[model samples]
Target: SPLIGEIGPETYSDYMSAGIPLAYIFAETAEERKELSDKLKPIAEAQRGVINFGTIDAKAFGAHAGNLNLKTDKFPAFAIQEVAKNQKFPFDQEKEITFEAIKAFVDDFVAGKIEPSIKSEPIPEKQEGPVTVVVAKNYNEIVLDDTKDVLIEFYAPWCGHCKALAPKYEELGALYAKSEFKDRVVIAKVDATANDVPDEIQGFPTIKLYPAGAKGQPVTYSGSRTVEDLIKFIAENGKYKA
Candidate 1:
């Protein structure tokens, strides 16, 4: 007769239809457990999804003993023990699923574990242009063998500043793609994380401009980098015309 009374039945039916296993939240404190349960309740109820509200008492949980307790009004020691028994790995607190694991799972879903039937589409070759961003395995090879005046942007995937600047860099690349400066001033990128640039790249978003005749010694600029500022610096310092 209650509005939410059919939740259990609906939860079962939904899970059967979707063929996906349920997700549960396990917490140490009673309050924290309740907080997670309360948040997941509405969403689960609305979507008719199953979410078993559970608690893991760190006190009696031998692996994490002395780290947690269950002496609260809502989540007592007995309640936690009862709920924990139903958990996936009740005795494995040290090997519990974590945020980092979830993050890695998401990343794997996005980047790894491809469907067997789904063939990888070959990446199209870069159309010839002024600023060619040579994506290479070895930065040294690119640096040494490259004949044009190459301007390389050393970036890390996890760098916050590099992420912010990526869009601007692409826009700049497009802007200078087919102009007179295109073939002359070649634009390239090297993954500093993969390349392992010397001097321990303490600051992120570094740029190096290799002049036409310069071999080993290229002009280095570091910190708070901008597309407009970089263009100007190269024009003035490298004597880049037009």
Candidate 2:
């Protein structure tokens, strides 16, 4: 179809059945879809064979947005999908969702000038706490710091094991702050699901020690995740042996 199509619970197959790239809009309710139909069809009128345009009732199918690398909690979202290629361009929710903004979005989509959206949170430029925050951008700089022994914990936000071990990890960080080996040790953490990391995490809390002298070698931390146990491992494995 050369025009905007509605994708309801019943009409899903009709739009998705077509073998084409989708410039899809996701709206929460019927009225929202109606509004989008009124607003976006003109853009659809422009991009004929380049892509197919459709609106999905997000209340029913919003969970699928997670697979599309979008936040399910957000509403009235837009994404471009090249189906067979599995490429996705997720519109930024921080920007306004309007006729002009989206028109430009689709224009860039057709021109192949937009970037593919990846699954990750926004990078925090600086650490706000004792635990040096590690995102994808700063993973190597902190974790593999050649002048220090780095204790890095890769954990998930929803994991209870991470919650239970929080206090002890904090204690370890506090100890490092006051210790003489502060420069020789770095306590860091990364949210495994939120940030892309090289380490293959086996479970909720994965502690890996990167010693100062041996830059590439990583010693895995196991057993009770107690502050005392961590200190012992840092003492034995740390170059300065804090």
Candidate 3:
């Protein structure tokens, strides 16, 4: 099977700037790198345009590999870098590094089923308003609480629809602050572009409702983006009502 070329420190920037998904196989020795490369070739060919596969000799590019936080002690470690998002998904070292496992990792990444490695600013310390801003760190704590029904909006800052819904969402948050709605539910928003969200957000301004002690998948909200519409929907779907 045809394989991807080896990437060195010199070409790393150029390859990453191409805006395609990149898979790096970092091995301790040259022979192990080649063996792993040969095994990955078929899977790489299958992925083709969707992913760019490459092998990195960790010994030669030790510093470069370290920059990505790849554990050298693990020897043959695999990582997928989503260049556009500046996120990396490392293969679970505890699991066997077989072709099938690697393929599943790549597939989960493409499908946005895997959460990107969190490498950004720390989660905000204070909650200022009625709307709780959640990041990768506090998503589960805020949204998946057993005692609170949470309504979350996954939005991109630059998305026009998201911009349009900003006021309405905040209005919903304000309503939640009122005595009639307070303590019954939580209104929240996540900047999907900046944070590593657990779920797949297919489009901008996607809303989901999480019931108290939510154990299953979140319920996707597809109704109108108005405050009244959202309030009604959350009342019907969420664990609590206004």
lDDT (tens digit, per residue) of candidate 3 on 1-242: 23577887677787888789888888778888888888878889888878989888877775554445454466678888888877778776557778888988888888899986653334887889888998878988888887888899999989999999999899999888885768758899998876777888789989998887663757899887889998888888877765
Q: Which is the winner by lDDT between candidate 2 and candidate 3?
A: 2
Off by over 4 Å in 3: 1-10, 13-121
The models' CA-based lDDT, in order, is 0.47, 0.82, 0.80
Which lDDT tens digits does candidate 1 get at residues 1-242?
22122213335354335443233344556566555455444543443433323334433342322122211222222111112222221222334344444334323323434221111111226535433444433445555454556677778789998788887777667766656786667676656654334434565677777766675678787534677777776676563543
Give the number of the best model, judged by lDDT.
Answer: 2
lDDT of 2: 0.82
- Tell me the spans in candidate 1 whose CA falls farther than 4 Å from its real position: 1-138, 196-200, 222-224
TM-scores for all candidates: the values are 0.42, 0.82, 0.55
Q: What is the lDDT of candidate 3?
A: 0.80
For model 1, name the residue pairs that clash.
Answer: 130-182, 130-183
For residues 128-197, write the lDDT of model 2, one tens digit per residue: 6778888876787788778889999999999998989988898889889888877779988889887778
